[PDB]
Amino acid sequence: GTVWGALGHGINLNIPNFQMTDDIDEVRWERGSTLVAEFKRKMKPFLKSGAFEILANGDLKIKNLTRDDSGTYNVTVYSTNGTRILDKALDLRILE
Amino acid sequence: GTVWGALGHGINLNIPNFQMTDDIDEVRWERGSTLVAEFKRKMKPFLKSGAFEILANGDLKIKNLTRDDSGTYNVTVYSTNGTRILDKALDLRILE
Numbered sequence: 328g329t330v331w332g333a334l335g336h337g338i339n340l341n342i343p344n345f346q347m348t349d350d351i352d353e354v355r356w357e358r359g360s361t362l363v364a365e366f367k368r369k370m371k372p373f374l375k376s377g378a379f380e381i382l383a384n385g386d387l388k389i390k391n392l393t394r395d396d397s398g399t400y401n402v403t404v405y406s407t408n409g410t411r412i413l414d415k416a417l418d419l420r421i422l423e
Numbered sequence: 424g425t426v427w428g429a430l431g432h433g434i435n436l437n438i439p440n441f442q443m444t445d446d447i448d449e450v451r452w453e454r455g456s457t458l459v460a461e462f463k464r465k466m467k468p469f470l471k472s473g474a475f476e477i478l479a480n481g482d483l484k485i486k487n488l489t490r491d492d493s494g495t496y497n498v499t500v501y502s503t504n505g506t507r508i509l510d511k512a513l514d515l516r517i518l519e
Contacts, residue, residue, distance in 0.1 A: 328513070328514060329513075329514045329516055330513050330514065330515050330516070331515075331516050331517075331518055332485070332488045332492075332515060332516075332517050332518070333488065333517070333518050333519075334488055334489070334490070334517050334518065334519040335487060335488060336487070336488060337484060337485060337486050337487060337488070338484070338485050338488055338515075339478065339482050339483070339484050340482060340483045340484075340485070340496055340498075340513055340515065341482050342480075342481050342482060342498050342500065342509070342511070343509075343511050343513070344509075345481070345500065345508075345509060346480075347479070347480040347481050350502045350503050351481070351500060351501070351502055351503070351508065352501055352502060352503050353458075353500070353501040354477070354481035354498065354499075354500050354501075355498065355499050355500075355501075356477070356483045356496060356497070356498050357496070357497045357498075357499075358494060358495065358496050358497070359494070361471065362449075362469055362471065363470075363471045363475055363483065363496070364468070364469065364470050364471060364475050364476075364477040364483055365468040365469045365470075365477065366468060366477045366478075366479075366481045367468045370466055372460075372461045372462065372463040373458055373460065373461050373501075373505060374459075374460050374461075375457070375458070375459045375460060375504075375505050379459055379460055380460075381450070381452070381460040381461070381462050382435070383443070384438075384441075384442075384443040385438055385441065385443050385447070385450035385462050386435050386436060386437050386438060387435070387436040387452045387459065387460055388433060388434070388435050388436075389428070389433065389434045389436070390433050391431060391432065391433060392428045392429065392430050392431060392432055392433070392434050393430065394430060396428075397428075398454065398455070399454070399455070400436055400452060400453070400454050400459070401452070401453045401454075402436075402438050402450065402451070402452055402453075403450075403451045403453075404438065404441070404447060404449070404450050404451075405447075405448050405449040405450075405451075405469075406446050406447060406448060407446050407447070407448045407464075408471075409448075409469060409471050413438070413441065415438070415439060416424075417424065417425075417426055417436055418424060418425045418426065419426050419428060419434070419436065420425060420426070420427050420428070421427075421428060421429075421430060422427050422428065422429050422430075423430070
């Protein structure tokens with residue numbers, strides 16, 4: 328919902344029904360097609376596990392395809408000023 | 424839009440109409456409500472400008488509210504294993 332601020336003064340936008348814990352590694356705040364700020368806990372870029380690899384050009388590699396690996400993957404690309412320039416849902420299907 | 428893979432082999436999910444350039448800061452891959460991988464050009468967390476600040480509990484501070492700051496802000500929170508804990512929208516209304 329709605330948050331009310333006063334023109335010319337500062338404001339803290341609170342994450343609704345949340346408390347920061349040791350298990351949270353990232354918070355992302357976006358507005359429109361712009362990334363505004365991020366909180367990170369770790370130095371390394373995230374990688375879910377050893378079954379995946381991110382290539383040097385940004386492509387995602389799935390190492391040994393499984394029937395449970397099919398479905399929709401969403402890729403989002405941000406420029407150096409925070410603009411979301413590309414967003415795409417990709418349908419990964421099995422050739423059966 | 425649709426990528427086809429054979430079971431038992433590796434598959435590359437290519438970002439369509441895309442060439443990794445120097446203006447690209449982040450590439451994020453998600454599968455539903457789970458983060459899978461990310462490319463990050465810089466180690467430091469992103470911050471759009473000095474007008475904003477990310478607090479240590481994850482809340483966003485807008486230091487001096489202007490009329491262009493009203494609107495909807497989206498916050499998404501990820502845990503250590505990539506699960507998206509929350510995805511909420513806040514509407515900022517300004518009093519003068």
